[PDB]
Each structure stands twice: as structure tokens, then as C-alpha cells.
Design a binder for this molecule. Structure first.
Ligand SMILES: CN(CCC(=O)O)[N+](C)(C)C
Ligand SMILES: CN(CCC(=O)O)[N+](C)(C)C
Ligand SMILES: O=C(O)CNC(=O)C(=O)O
Ligand SMILES: O=C(O)CNC(=O)C(=O)O
Ligand SMILES: NCCCCCCN
Ligand SMILES: NCCCCCCN
Ligand SMILES: [Zn+2]
Ligand SMILES: [Zn+2]
Ligand SMILES: [Zn+2]
Ligand SMILES: [Zn+2]
Lengths: 385, 385
């Protein structure tokens, strides 16, 4: 009854097609949108699933010249004698009602998040299962998206595991630190990450205008002298900050902060960016947190009077991150991999002791969220079919 | 006189340091910013050029406890007995006056653009010179940034040339179409690019939330039956659109359009994005154009009443691109490479004739603007020194 056509007709100077479905619901489709989306082989390249029709070919004032229908299809003639057929279910799916558009957006983008604090139960899967089974890899990425982190257990204690995950997704995101990189204490460290020092809460690579969406971190070797991990849900923290300190929230979401990274690794580099620490979409929703205190530049491009208040805002934000209600602490063991949303979570590390041998070794890599969502969409189709 | 200190003192409850320079100009530096940016080995990791100091260590209400100076340095004691030294020239550079901040921003980001229409003189350099000489590679990237395109002549007529350029920059941007990709007519084409059809003006890869910043395109083989290239300066076009049709400008800069790409190439993929076609920064300046008509989805997530007006806006925008005043047409020959800003220009191709042999073959690749600007900054330092 819902995807079956009871009536189709041209309305409103023939600029609109209305469909009455057999459940009695009605849908409206602009004539211009129908012509733009003709699936015939002139207008649409089936092998690419792409529009061939040019904007230049489109009469924005077009109306339907003729229409007939049956229960599964509408058949339209256009004023220039072009002919189009549309399938009922295709049409139903692309209905312009708020409810139908939102439903489809949820299927495309998996928007649901579960916010968390110190009460987090760390979602956990087996590494080899994830590589072997689509049901597991599907659980992995959907949970990555929804919760922001998934731990995988049972990997080897050897380099190369994050690469296997990268291929399972599709491919890893290359940066100046390499395809993969080794988190360990290094002489003449080009990055505070490559020391035994404490890392306070940060996101990786705000020095790039497009920071890595997803981070993978694999414990090869762990130390007993420190080195615990800490995470916090940045979206949860920002919500608490907006409520507790609207003014600190307004400063962090409007102030451009300069980030910098100069050195040599995969390549020689001199990198500069500007970001709002709390990044809002056009509807005011937090979509990304951009913050590493190590790489925040000495250069600070704001008027002198805005400086101290910026710092006071940042301090509030960091205190919230550090609160016992927000943060979750755990310690990785050899064979553990964490995969997390590097746009939403902040992460850190406790200091540990330097020594003559390497007491501690992680391998990390990055992936792009579009690459991950692509794999998530394909996996879902496979597991539901 | 300008970088030499005549007087330094603590003011405003010691929350501010003022410097009188020997030219009689004055600079103010917040106490919090000075402490945050202490260069001592406790606070700052010289090998990484990164801040070690945590936000948690910073008293946002700090004032200077004591200060002395000489002509090249200030020496500060803090209330908790921490001690800092700052160099005059370091301080002068990071002055918070609007003029000093803007000057430094120009050095970091190379913001200048030369807008153009059909009168464009296509900037042109030799390929091997660019690979061999920093003076040339510097001219290449600075002109790429400023004008939005540079043509390189004298490459081979063989695959692998865009890779050489990728390494000269640093590295290429991997996508689902590969590290490099071959633009030629293909059976079961996964993309309208891989046919003999006309490509109207578009940017590449709006199906990604972070489209490629820079595109490289190398003519291996060219056809006499068509296949001319066309470019347009999208920033120039948007400026003309805002003026001629403010309403069309407002619709294209505020409406989220869905892009899609589903298929198999480097990997299997199902990619989805949303973008405003004319993307504005927070000050209302156009920073990116996101538009490929082939990959614009059938799904269109707006209320029914906004549909036809969107199409009318888009049509105006495309007509402007196609105007004889805006567009620049040229034809690539074997050995030519074009490198251009894929955020600013739109590009296209005239149709040509199918046949049994391959009459036409380009190799393309992408690079990220941060990778390109990094190389641009390093090159400048080398060529000026
Ligand atoms: C880039 N990075 C994270 C820290 C940073 O943002 O500088 N590595 C761990 C890869 C060094
Ligand atoms: C992705 N691409 C450009 C066209 C597109 O945006 O789909 N290739 C030329 C690489 C096919
Ligand atoms: O060493 C760790 O536990 C975590 N590392 C990082 O967050 C990093 O290298 O940026
Ligand atoms: O074939 C050409 O001349 C230009 N190609 C493209 O713009 C493309 O492949 O997206
Ligand atoms: N079953 C309806 C077929 C209509 C074809 C019309 C061609 N102009
Ligand atoms: N030339 C000035 C040196 C000042 C050192 C002060 C240490 N507290
Ligand atoms: Zn058609
Ligand atoms: Zn990190
Ligand atoms: Zn110090
Ligand atoms: Zn293209």
C-alpha cells in the first residue's frame, strides 16, 4: 500500500507531480527535479550510477507535458518530447517530506551517538574476528561511529597489525609522520608523543586543516612505570561546558587558534593551520574538537584584549575534561588495539620512566571518516543481505 | 631601532608587559601568554619546537613578579619562582597589533589571489626545471596558490610524471580512484570522466567531505576529434554572482547538496557527502566551490518549496561560468601537465569521438593543500636564503 501508486498527476501549472499511494499518503515531486533525475541512458550513466545530463540542458521552468501511471511506475513526456520513466519505490524513498528525508539521512550517515563519562564500558571485539567476519567488522565500525571508540583484543605483539585494519577499512591516511608511526621514546624527538612525558588531553593533528577522523593505536610493548591511557568524550564535555559556562563555550567555538608543526619525518615539513577548538556546524552542533596543546602555536592571532579571556575559557574546558565524571582511564597491554573517533574524543597518556632499552612501543595510523563510512555502508548491505 | 628594546615593564596589575622599542613604537604582551610561551627546557621541547607546558600548569590570572631587560632580551620571574627569558625579535614578530598579526598571517598563508577571466595568460614553466631547481619549484607553487593554475611543459609522454611532481611536493593524496588514475574511455566506466563525453564545469570529488585541494593532470595522448580543456576562476564567478544575483548567491552558499559515488576502483566504495556549492568562511568569503553535476545525488535533502529555486540559482551560476568573459579554453598536448587549485577553479572537457583504439589518455593525481603549502613555505626559506 505504501510503495504502490493509486494516483499520479501533474499539478500547479504542471510544475509538480503528486502521487497518492495506496495507504492514502501523498508525495509531491517538482517537475525540475524529475527531469534533472531522468534515469534514461541519455541522462544517466548506469555503469557509473552518475548523471550525464548537464545543468545547461535543464529548463528550470519546465512542467510535465503528459503523464500516465500504473501501480509500480510513472511515465512522463516532457515539453521538448523527452521521455522519462520512474519507479515507485525509487520515488517513495526520495520523498521530500521532513520525515522521509530524515529517515534516509540516518541510513546514509549513521548520526546516532551515545555520550559517555567515567562510566563507559569499553566496547571490545576480537582482532582476527573483525578481519575475518563481516558481522564483526560491521559491529566494529558502527560502534566506532556511535560510541567513538572500540578496543580490539588478541592482535600480535608485532608491527603491521594496524595496516591489516587499514586494509579491512580500505586504506590508511598518509601524513608527514608516515603510513604508520611508532610511539616510543626517541633521541631528538620531533614530537612530544615520542618522549616519556605525559600527554594531556588532545586530538591528533590539529596542525592540519583536515585532521585525521579515526585513529588506530596498537600496543606492541607496555611499561609498568606508567603509560596508562585516558579518554574523554569531547561532545559530552562541550555540552557540559555550554551549560556551565556559556561564555567559555562562545569563546572556544568562535576563536581561531593557530597550530604549527615544523620538522622532518616521512618528509621535511613546515605545517600551519587555524581552527576553532570547538567546531560547530551551521546549526550550532559540535562536529569537531581541534586541540593539541603541544602544537598550539606561540603565534596567536587575536587582539590583545581577547587573549587572557581565551586562556580562561581553555582552562575551564580542560578542567572539565579532567573531571572524574568525564574521563575514562585504562591501560593497554601488548596485543590491544584501540580505534577511535579523533574528531570527538580527546586522548592522553600518563608519563613513564626513560631508560636504556625501549620499555614502551605503540604503532599508530590514521584513517579518513569518509573511507570508514564507505566501508560501514557496504558492510551493512552485506550483513543485512 | 624597531627590534631593539628601550624599555620593558609590567603594567595593569602586572598582567601585561609593555615594550617601548627604540623607534618609539610600543607593544603589549599579556602575562598569561608569556608564561604559556616560556621557551625554557621545562616548558618547551626544542627538538620538536613544541610546548610541553600543560594547560593545567597555567595560572590564567598570573602576573609578572619581576622583570629586567637589556636591548635584546627580557628576563622575567614569576610568582611561583619560575623564570623565563624572551628574545626581542621573537617578541616583535608576535606583536598583537592588527598590522603585525596580519603581516605574519600573510607570510604563513600566502593569501593573495589574482582573479581572472577569459584574458588569462596561462602561467607556464618547464617540467624538468621545476623538479631540478628550487627557484622554479618556488615559482610553481606560489603561482599555483596565487593564480590557481600553472601549466608545466616538456614532460614525457609516459605514465609516472605526476608521481615525480607528487614527490617534489611531498606526497600525493590517495583516493578510491588510486594514487594516480588514467583518464581514458573505458568499458563499463565507473565514472563519466572515463568516457568520451563532455564534462561541464565541475570540481573533482565533492563526494568527499574534504575534496582534493590540488589536481595534477598530464596529457599522455591527445585526440584531434575534440577534448579541449576549459577552466574558470570560481572565486571570480562567485563574486560576479553575488553582485548580479544576490538571491542565487544566498541559496548556493546556504543549501546543503548531497553528493554520491558508488562503485569499484582502487577499492570497493559507497561514498556520500553534503556540501554547500559555494562554501563561505565565517567572515563570508568564498573559500571553496564544491560542485560536480555528475556526482550530485538524486537524493536532495531540502523541503519541496526550496527545490525549484535551488535549480534556478544553480542555472544562473553555470551560465556565468560559461560566459565568454569568464572561461579560458586551451588544448593540452602530450607532455603538458596542468596543476591547479581544485577548491577555486572549475574545469571541464569537450566531448571527443569514441573508437577502437585509445585516442586520448591523461594521468591525474591529487594533493592536499596543507602538503603543498608546507612545501611552499620550505621552498621560500631556501630560495630567500
Ligand atoms: C602527529 N602525531 C600526534 C601528535 C600531534 O598532533 O602532533 N603523532 C603521534 C603521529 C606524532
Ligand atoms: C574522481 N574523479 C573526478 C570526478 C568525480 O568527482 O567523480 N576522477 C577523475 C578521478 C575519476
Ligand atoms: O602514547 C600514547 O599512549 C598515546 N599517544 C598519543 O596520544 C600520541 O602519540 O599522540
Ligand atoms: O578529461 C579531461 O580533460 C579532464 N578530466 C576531468 O576533469 C576529470 O577526469 O574529472
Ligand atoms: N507501459 C507504458 C509504456 C509507455 C511508453 C511511452 C513511450 N512514449
Ligand atoms: N643577564 C641577565 C641574567 C638574569 C638571570 C636571572 C636568573 N634568575
Ligand atoms: Zn532522460
Ligand atoms: Zn595523540
Ligand atoms: Zn619555562
Ligand atoms: Zn575533473
Amino acid at each position: 500500500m505504501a510503495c504502490t501508486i493509486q494516483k499520479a498527476e501533474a499539478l500547479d501549472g504542471a510544475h509538480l507531480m503528486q502521487i497518492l499511494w495506496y495507504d492514502e499518503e501523498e508525495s509531491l515531486y517538482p517537475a525540475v527535479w524529475l527531469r534533472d533525475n531522468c534515469p534514461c541512458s541519455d541522462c544517466y550513466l548506469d555503469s557509473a550510477k552518475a548523471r550525464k545530463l548537464l545543468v545547461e540542458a535543464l529548463d528550470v521552468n519546465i512542467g510535465i507535458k503528459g503523464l500516465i501511471f500504473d501501480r509500480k511506475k510513472v511515465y512522463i513526456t516532457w515539453p521538448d518530447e523527452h521521455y522519462s520513466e520512474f519507479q515507485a519505490d525509487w520515488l517513495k524513498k526520495r520523498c521530500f517530506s521532513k520525515q522521509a528525508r530524515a529517515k534516509l539521512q540516518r541510513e546514509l550517515f549513521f548520526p546516532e551517538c551515545q555520550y559517555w563519562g567515567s562510566e563507559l564500558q569499553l566496547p571490545t571485539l576480537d582482532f582476527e574476528d573483525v578481519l575475518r567476519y563481516d558481522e564483526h567488522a560491521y559491529k566494529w565500525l558502527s560502534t566506532l561511529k556511535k560510541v567513538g571508540i572500540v578496543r580490539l583484543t588478541g592482535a600480535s605483539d608485532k608491527p603491521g597489525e594496524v595496516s591489516k585494519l587499514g586494509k579491512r577499512m580500505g586504506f590508511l591516511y598518509l601524513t608527514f609522520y608516515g603510513h604508520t608511526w611508532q610511539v616510543q621514546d626517541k633521541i631528538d624527538a620531533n614530537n612530544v608523543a615520542y618522549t616519556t612525558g605525559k600527554l594531556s588531553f588532545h586530538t591528533d593533528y590539529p596542525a592540519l586543516h583536515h585532521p585525521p577522523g579515526v585513529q588506530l593505536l596498537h600496543c606492541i610493548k607496555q611499561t609498568v612505570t606508567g603509560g596508562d591511557s585516558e579518554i574523554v568524550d569531547g561532545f559530552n564535555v562541550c555540552q557540559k561546558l555550554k551549560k556551565n559556562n556559556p561564555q567559555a563555550f562562545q569563546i572556544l567555538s568562535s576563536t581561531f587558534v593557530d597550530f604549527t608543526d615544523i620538522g622532518v619525518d616521512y618528509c621535511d615539513f613546515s605545517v600551519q593551520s587555524k581552527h576553532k577548538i570547538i567546531e560547530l556546524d551551521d546549526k550550532g552542533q559540535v562536529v569537531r574538537i581541534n586541540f593539541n596543546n603541544a602544537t598550539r602555536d606561540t603565534i596567536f592571532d587575536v587582539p590583545v584584549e581577547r587573549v587572557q579571556p581565551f586562556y580562561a575559557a581553555l582552562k575551564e574546558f580542560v578542567d572539565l575534561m579532567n573531571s572524574k565524571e568525564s574521563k575514562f582511564t585504562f591501560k593497554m597491554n601488548p596485543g590491544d588495539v584501540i580505534t577511535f573517533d579523533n574528531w570527538r574524543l580527546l586522548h592522553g597518556r600518563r608519563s613513564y620512566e626513560a631508560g636504556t632499552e625501549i620499555s614502551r612501543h605503540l604503532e599508530g595510523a590514521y584513517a579518513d571518516w569518509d573511507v570508514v563510512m564507505s566501508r560501514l555502508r557496504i558492510l551493512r548491505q552485506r550483513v543485512e543481505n
